Design a protein around this motif. Sequence first.
Motif, PDB file in Angstrom:
ATOM      1  N   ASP A  56      21.581 -27.873  57.853  1.00 29.66           N
ATOM      2  CA  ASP A  56      21.709 -28.744  59.016  1.00 29.66           C
ATOM      3  C   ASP A  56      21.109 -30.074  58.650  1.00 29.66           C
ATOM      4  OD1 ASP A  56      22.798 -26.812  60.865  1.00 29.66           O
ATOM      5  OD2 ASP A  56      20.770 -25.979  61.049  1.00 29.66           O
ATOM      6  N   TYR A  57      21.871 -31.148  58.843  1.00 32.08           N
ATOM      7  CA  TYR A  57      21.396 -32.494  58.512  1.00 32.08           C
ATOM      8  C   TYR A  57      21.370 -33.392  59.734  1.00 32.08           C
ATOM      9  CZ  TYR A  57      22.722 -30.955  53.766  1.00 32.08           C
ATOM     10  OH  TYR A  57      22.837 -30.264  52.583  1.00 32.08           O
ATOM     11  N   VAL A  58      20.408 -34.317  59.756  1.00 35.32           N
ATOM     12  CA  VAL A  58      20.417 -35.406  60.711  1.00 35.32           C
ATOM     13  C   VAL A  58      20.828 -36.669  59.953  1.00 35.32           C
ATOM     14  CG1 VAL A  58      19.084 -36.807  62.347  1.00 35.32           C
ATOM     15  CG2 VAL A  58      18.682 -34.339  62.146  1.00 35.32           C
ATOM     16  N   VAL A  59      22.036 -37.144  60.240  1.00 30.78           N
ATOM     17  CA  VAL A  59      22.623 -38.265  59.536  1.00 30.78           C
ATOM     18  C   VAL A  59      22.600 -39.478  60.448  1.00 30.78           C
ATOM     19  CG1 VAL A  59      24.621 -39.013  58.197  1.00 30.78           C
ATOM     20  CG2 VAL A  59      24.088 -36.588  58.341  1.00 30.78           C
ATOM     21  N   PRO A  86      17.026 -34.904  47.336  1.00 27.12           N
ATOM     22  CA  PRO A  86      17.919 -33.990  48.045  1.00 27.12           C
ATOM     23  C   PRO A  86      17.545 -33.771  49.515  1.00 27.12           C
ATOM     24  CG  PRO A  86      17.227 -33.045  45.943  1.00 27.12           C
ATOM     25  CD  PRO A  86      16.376 -34.272  46.178  1.00 27.12           C
ATOM     26  N   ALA A  87      18.559 -33.655  50.370  1.00 29.12           N
ATOM     27  CA  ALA A  87      18.345 -33.518  51.805  1.00 29.12           C
ATOM     28  C   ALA A  87      17.966 -32.076  52.146  1.00 29.12           C
ATOM     29  CB  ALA A  87      19.592 -33.939  52.561  1.00 29.12           C
ATOM     30  N   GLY A  88      18.764 -31.135  51.650  1.00 24.75           N
ATOM     31  CA  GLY A  88      18.497 -29.714  51.843  1.00 24.75           C
ATOM     32  C   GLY A  88      18.634 -28.962  50.544  1.00 24.75           C
ATOM     33  N   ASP A 106      20.465 -43.422  53.860  1.00 23.58           N
ATOM     34  CA  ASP A 106      20.592 -42.050  53.350  1.00 23.58           C
ATOM     35  C   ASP A 106      19.611 -41.149  54.118  1.00 23.58           C
ATOM     36  OD1 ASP A 106      17.988 -42.393  51.850  1.00 23.58           O
ATOM     37  OD2 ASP A 106      19.195 -43.703  50.589  1.00 23.58           O
ATOM     38  N   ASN A 107      19.445 -39.908  53.662  1.00 25.05           N
ATOM     39  CA  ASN A 107      18.512 -38.975  54.292  1.00 25.05           C
ATOM     40  C   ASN A 107      17.065 -39.486  54.458  1.00 25.05           C
ATOM     41  OD1 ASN A 107      19.422 -38.077  51.444  1.00 25.05           O
ATOM     42  ND2 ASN A 107      17.283 -37.404  51.537  1.00 25.05           N
ATOM     43  N   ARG A 108      16.651 -40.496  53.704  1.00 19.63           N
ATOM     44  CA  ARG A 108      15.323 -41.086  53.898  1.00 19.63           C
ATOM     45  C   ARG A 108      15.237 -42.008  55.108  1.00 19.63           C
ATOM     46  NH1 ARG A 108      14.905 -43.825  47.998  1.00 19.63           N
ATOM     47  NH2 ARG A 108      17.070 -44.144  48.666  1.00 19.63           N
TER      48      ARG A 108
END
Lengths: 564, 566, 566
Positions: free
Chosen positions: B95-98, B8-10, C109-111
């Motif tokens: 907040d994501y960095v994509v 999971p990202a967040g 992906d997020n990784r």
Amino acid sequence: AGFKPAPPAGQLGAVIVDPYGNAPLTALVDLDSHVISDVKVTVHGKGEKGVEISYPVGQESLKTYDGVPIFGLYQKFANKVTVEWKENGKVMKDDYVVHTSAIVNNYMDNRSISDLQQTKVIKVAPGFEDRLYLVNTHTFTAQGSDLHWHGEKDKNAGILDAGPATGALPFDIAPFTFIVDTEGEYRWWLDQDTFYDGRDRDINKRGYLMGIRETPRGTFTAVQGQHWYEFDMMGQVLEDHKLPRGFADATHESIETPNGTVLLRVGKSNYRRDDGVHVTTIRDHILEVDKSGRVVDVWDLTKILDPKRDALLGALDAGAAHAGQQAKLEPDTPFGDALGVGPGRNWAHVNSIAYDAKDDSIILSSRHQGVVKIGRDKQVKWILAPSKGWEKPLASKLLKPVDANGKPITCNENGLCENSDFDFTYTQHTAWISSKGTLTIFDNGDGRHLEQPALPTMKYSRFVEYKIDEKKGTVQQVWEYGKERGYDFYSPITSIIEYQADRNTMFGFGGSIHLFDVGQPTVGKLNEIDYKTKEVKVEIDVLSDKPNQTHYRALLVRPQQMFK
Amino acid sequence: AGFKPAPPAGQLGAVIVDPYGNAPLTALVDLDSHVISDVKVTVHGKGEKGVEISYPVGQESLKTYDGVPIFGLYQKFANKVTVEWKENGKVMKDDYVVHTSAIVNNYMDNRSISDLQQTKVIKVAPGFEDRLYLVNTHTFTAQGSDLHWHGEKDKNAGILDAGPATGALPFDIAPFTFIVDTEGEYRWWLDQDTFYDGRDRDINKRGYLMGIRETPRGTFTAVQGQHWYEFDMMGQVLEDHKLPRGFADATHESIETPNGTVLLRVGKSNYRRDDGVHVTTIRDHILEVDKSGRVVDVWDLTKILDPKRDALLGALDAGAVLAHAGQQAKLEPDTPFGDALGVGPGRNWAHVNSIAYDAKDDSIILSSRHQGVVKIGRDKQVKWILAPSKGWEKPLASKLLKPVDANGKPITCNENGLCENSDFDFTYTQHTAWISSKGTLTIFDNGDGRHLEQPALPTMKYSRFVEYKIDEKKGTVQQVWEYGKERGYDFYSPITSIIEYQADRNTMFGFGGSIHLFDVGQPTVGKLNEIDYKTKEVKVEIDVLSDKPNQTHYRALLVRPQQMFK
Amino acid sequence: AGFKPAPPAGQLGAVIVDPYGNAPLTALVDLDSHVISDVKVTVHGKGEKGVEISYPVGQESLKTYDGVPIFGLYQKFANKVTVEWKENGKVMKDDYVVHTSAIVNNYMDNRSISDLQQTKVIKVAPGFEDRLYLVNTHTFTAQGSDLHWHGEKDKNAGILDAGPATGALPFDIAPFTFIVDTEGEYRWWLDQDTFYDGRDRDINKRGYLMGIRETPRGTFTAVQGQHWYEFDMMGQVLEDHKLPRGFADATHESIETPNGTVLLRVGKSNYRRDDGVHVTTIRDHILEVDKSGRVVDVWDLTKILDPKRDALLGALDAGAVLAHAGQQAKLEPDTPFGDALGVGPGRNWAHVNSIAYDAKDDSIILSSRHQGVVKIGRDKQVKWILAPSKGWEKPLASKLLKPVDANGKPITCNENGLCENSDFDFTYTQHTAWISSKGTLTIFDNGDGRHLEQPALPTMKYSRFVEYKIDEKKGTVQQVWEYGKERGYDFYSPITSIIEYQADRNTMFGFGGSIHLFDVGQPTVGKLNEIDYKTKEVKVEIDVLSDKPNQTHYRALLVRPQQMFK
Ligand SMILES: [Cl-]
Ligand SMILES: [Cl-]
Ligand SMILES: [Cl-]
Ligand SMILES: [Cl-]
Ligand SMILES: [Cl-]
Ligand SMILES: [Cl-]
Ligand SMILES: [Cl-]
Ligand SMILES: [Cl-]
Ligand SMILES: [Cl-]
Ligand SMILES: [Cl-]
Ligand SMILES: [Cl-]
Ligand SMILES: [Cl-]
Ligand SMILES: [Cl-]
């Protein structure tokens, strides 16, 4: 939780019907980790006169299939099969009952007589009951030819006009591929879906399945359209290659050489003519490809032979609706799959290839020009043809006919000889090298002596064999058959012969007998003719499932060789 | 063990880039079994003047994607994305960095200027910085047109001759499909391989990707070759239907109706002419199909309009339909059947290029490039025609609309459609005859063959955005709006193009797809515009330049993130 | 009309970018029926220190491609290319500007750190600026391992229980395949979609792309999952063969022999154990196949070596085979069948990871990660073993090679392979046991479980490049070269990796594929090296950094343009 695999049938594993999904009259006895040797399979005959099929299976096959391959089953039947082997030093045997399903023809319409092609056994001499024949035939699709290559527009063409077609994409038909025994029973079937799909418009699965030839492994090569293939008698597709990007329209022949390469007959796409127009050429290039599908060599026949020679072209049957009518060549024939001279038209129609391992050369059959040997060096070594139309430098390569004492036979420019049985070949097929070293040809005989006869029924076909002396430049006719069988033995197109050394017969398939009888099925006649006595040892007719639908070729196949 | 899935990202699941594999500038926040509502996504602008992309996501979309769809990412960039939601009565935010990858053009050769189509922002008025535009354009393949339908041989053809071609299978090109913001930045890309493969010869993946139109669900329909499709902004292919077996060559338009059906523009394969010859007809059949791909209705225009009317056909530029450009089309009696200018079934006599459904009377409005604009009823009767009167015979002549001014008094025009003492003009080789939200008829009036002739000099051509008011009972038409007439040849699109009235900001949207098409060696200009309806001020102007010279664009759409994820 | 093909670029045909659609940094000059010879291509360096790529093109390649193949282009760049040839006895030359598109990573992906793997040039000695290296690496998919082979239920399993898995189908990852020059620039890219589709569930397009090895034709073989392949540097897929029906899970190696056959490393599906249970075995079967995909021979190693020998198996790091890293592997009697460390057919008892064909005696040399290095004959008899003596029983014990020094006098080593008063050491969890051009045996000695134990502290591990001389008649082995022992844990690859002696410049090439693999959150380092054989000077050192953390590389190859286009 699940569903378990099929359990073992006897003392090895399960018996799976049609393991690869392409051959419904085959089966496989799973090895189930058994270590076996000295394997022999016997499929017992159906009924009283039923033909038994028996053969050995070598280790590579056992290893490749992970089991014992069962070939020669009848459709829709409780086949009785016996498998024998050696294991742990002991002699072993199982009997299986192998139920099969039906053979299906997926291409039927109001022209269909019935679903399958009917067989009629005419003659089976003693000692020939065991023979099997793979029949390479085809069946019309409902929609017919639906696709064309797009060509380059002509500067002489109308301003508003859409561009023209080029090449031979319409040369496309459903396959009908089976093996028949001497009781007229089907003993093998290659699912039409294996290579072909006539309803979809994937050009990868379109074309005309042809040039089925045995390999040194006891497998077969074949071409269809824009691909070439290898397959075995279990219905496994072993190779599937796109043609190299410069070539298109592979038909008539594929043959594996001793050097691990394969010879193909193709046309050249985007061929730039001297006048700067680009075309897809027709049946006038030979490729040598390796098992990676790469081009080892190419012979461009438009630079080797003479695309301008209309000696035979102007003498051909236009029906091969306009049947019987001699072909009137026109200078403005649009480029395409049409009779005519020059690159972009059907000037050559090469329909067979033979590799001469002795001098690393190829022998070709040009339907519309004759039979030629071409060297690795791309030089013509000899031509077997009537002398009319040939010019220097090619004229000097023409073979000079001679009798059994070596003395010249006299013939006119049209190939009519005096005081002699000798004759050239006309619109011929399968110009191959027999096991004796001689040249065998199926001489269809349209445009014989460079003319159409007074009456259509005067035409005839021959099985013919020649002995050539390449040093002296002389050819001798050493054997013939069929001239005296008349119209019921005339195949205007297709067809094949091949000498069989095992029983000293000439094998033959005339693929277009009665083609012109509008509304009647076309006869494909399998023959084995005693080389010495000329007695008919085998005769079996195959009748097309729609009227006026030619067959292409047949092969004499041998189970002993199928499973190396 | 194996390889684990992305962690999971967040506070929800992993963030997967390009979940369906067709849209590299999208991503998905996996729901990972969380129950959420009031989803809002914000993709932040890149740099100082970068445009923010923001939108809500409804429950159907969350359920369909099993996640939160992220739309509007920049290529090859550490995108900054904010997702807000409600869970267990509590307001939540991540907040994501994509990071994203590159956009790839798979179809390049010596004609290529560079790999992508260049943009040039000309004007962006205050209050229009947020606008996004989906550009439906294309890029030449190395081999060009390589396939034809096989036709029926002519009895007048040579005996030895191979059979002829028929239909329009060579109408085949690679797609180039993106969304552009008011900074000229690519904010969405549809993988070319999604629908097309120009290197393989599977005709199922050939054609000319066209007629991209929004559905009631915020998804889009489209046509390419022998198939029609529906897709969404996550790059998910929602429908792929073969055309029914009677029909071929689907181009130009697809539009879903209120009734769950889709209207397509096709040709009839194996059409039997009165003389008994079979041809694939060209751009002259309308299908209504359901979501099962079945035919609900068909309009065979060869029996409804007049395929012999050559009034406009003979007046056209040969270069359009390079260089036989500038030259007037000389029709021939012996033009072979195919995608060629000419009269009769089997030739390009109608070239119908747009469809509109009038839900008020269950009718269809068509743009015939070579004949004009027509309304046809469910009953297959022509209700009205908008065209110059020349060439029309009875009974169709009586269906021609009569031009009138704002007081409703007749306007005098000759048979070529040139009017006296009036701003009124008919449309010529036009596109997108649609029904605006006001109920008026909007048309892109390309203007080739204007007044049924080629002009004195080639550059004496112009295009217009134009809108009309039609009184169907009286059989009268009034021109109520126009634009582009004064902008000359630099605003002239000989082909393609589209307009559409936008009620939200009272603009007329337009895309001229073929500006400077004939400029040998120059890229072709696709000009996005929004023109203030009231003042005629240019609120937006953005130019797209083709990646090879002399390569037309087709259409563009004003797209709205708020509607993309129902 | 249609769309024409690309027009000629210069004095030959069009220049097409990525003709086969698998290799975006290639192009082809179409022959357009020209007859030519003495073809030489030069792709010029980008900028000031850019590396030039230059090579001849033979007649077979010209004929196969119907054109001149252009290899070595930079992404997203106006490449400067020069093609020289002879035609009609006259020397000819063309200069082309070949624009290219982008390289795309379809698996992010997020990784993801960013989309591509970063390079870092550490050392490039004079005379090695021209070297090119093909890196066989991979990138995690969003979903991870999603599929298993179904196995046979255990009679000791619960009555209600679903059936178990078997085999190694989860050994599945997206590929990341490029060539890098000595400036760290990507000069070739193999489209991920060429062989792989991680989003679809067609098992025909799943696996772990591995065993990329040059063929006698300058093309390459490779394996992925249940298929083996041959491809060339233009991105043409030349062979695609399903594994024969008895076998599954092809990984680690493919090598074409002089005899036109190809050696593969597979498992046996439906293998019947002595206790009657059926399993898919793991990494313990060698196939020899022909170009028809048929089986010429097989070596079932479960009947040839000893699947019960756990001397090395019990000594391994649990984290390798994250974090159960550092911990020694504790074998269990009840480890379920599958891709798991353990003894017996059905478990990962051998993990064979390289194959070499000894044409001198028609034998094969294998690297078993979990057992050592072995030569097996055509006759299926073990000829020799290189391994610590512990755990080996008779008859195999008598095949163990005896360590000797340069004078040929015995070296004293314990059963764990720790030698006295000597530089000699055995190999442990090793890779690529190949035959150098000198006839010696070269091995990448990873060094996990060195001396059949885990060390006192985790960082007390090292890898070596090592070369041996074997006297087969005497049954003796001499260590004649080594490197890396002194470079410590920063040069330690717990898994993967490769070495290969290069005679042309007398270097030992190497690629350590898993440096800093256990560094939680850090990219994994793939270190390309060329070490001067005589002086042991570092002539080349280049680092490749994974695009996600803790993501191993597999191998790299020293590739040579002069050989690519026979
Ligand atoms: Cl019986
Ligand atoms: Cl039965
Ligand atoms: Cl049984
Ligand atoms: Cl993140
Ligand atoms: Cl750019
Ligand atoms: Cl829309
Ligand atoms: Cl007409
Ligand atoms: Cl105006
Ligand atoms: Cl150029
Ligand atoms: Cl980068
Ligand atoms: Cl290699
Ligand atoms: Cl066990
Ligand atoms: Cl050292």
